[PDB]
Design a binder for this molecule. Sequence first.
Ligand SMILES: Cc1ccccc1-c1ccc2nc(N)c(C[C@@H](C)C(=O)N[C@@H]3CCOC(C)(C)C3)cc2c1
Length: 364
Amino acid sequence: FVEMVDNLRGKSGQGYYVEMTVGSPPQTLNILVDTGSSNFAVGAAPHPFLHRYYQRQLSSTYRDLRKGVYVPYTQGKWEGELGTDLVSIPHGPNVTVRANIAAITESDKFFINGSNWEGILGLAYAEIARPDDSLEPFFDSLVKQTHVPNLFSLQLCGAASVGGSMIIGGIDHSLYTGSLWYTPIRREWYYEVIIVRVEINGQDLKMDCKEYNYDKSIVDSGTTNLRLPKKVFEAAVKSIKAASSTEKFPDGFWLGEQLVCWTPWNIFPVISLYLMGEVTNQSFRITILPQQYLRPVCYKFAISQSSTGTVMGAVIMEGFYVVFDRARKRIGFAVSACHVHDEFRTAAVEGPFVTLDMEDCGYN
Ligand SMILES: Cc1ccccc1-c1ccc2nc(N)c(C[C@@H](C)C(=O)N[C@@H]3CCOC(C)(C)C3)cc2c1
């Protein structure tokens, strides 16, 4: 798998992207890697922000599906025209697939000015695909049409350029230390998981574990922040505040809108999430450092409130090697060989723990 190591790039805050080709002859595009959506969508028109775009006129293997797609988001949108064509990943497996492609023809607040990517690879499941679940996502096509095992893994390394690896069809054991620990994919739409306990510096928040997963908890490479449900965020901050009241901060910094410049680190607590294990009454925990939730912009607060559920974004994923084990409906976490630490504390994955009533923690 050494051909796929270090195949991810990006700039701080503008997502991680992989190089892909579409059409024949191949057109090279940089494509955002997103485990929190399910469409393969690329710019197909000369939008000012774009370095390049999909030119369908130039592709002999392109087929029109004669159907449109409109994708609104909380802020802005994209829309396009559905079709299929041949796709490959230069620093991925040595295969070629016919996949669905949304050719983006109109967008609003989608593309980023100054970014170096031109599309998005939705790696989540068909149920959240637009317009509906009959548009087969790229990874489903890849597995169906080739002998690539139904599994991928992400080492997101962070920092200004960022780097990483998407190991398609397997695991590279050199990218983590210790052991992988697995949590069940609760249902195949998002990569939904169940959090069963939260600790701020060893201290249980003592909330009903249901609140951690209201109305869901997901693993999302397209989100920067650790995102927590409203009630949980307030409890969490009230706790991080108290744990680090040796220094003073405006109430807007936790919302979170100011810097701080030099580094102590040690006034801030570690954050531990306990995830449902593979075995009845068994859990494990993942622990992140302030290095993960204090993002340079001098730093900013990268935990924020949400009404979509818990979102385990880059803040979480940058501490760990993450295995999206689709074949066994599970997600693996191990300590990342590249995560940003100091000489006191490191990110951790630890188990097993005894946790009762873990099935009560999921929202219905
Ligand atoms: C930023 C944007 C602008 C216009 C249209 C779509 C988007 C967009 C694209 C990909 C996204 N990928 C993501 N992982 C996220 C965050 C996650 C938690 C999320 O809300 N995912 C939804 C999955 C279904 O499709 C949605 C509604 C566009 C995002 C938001 C996204 C928003």
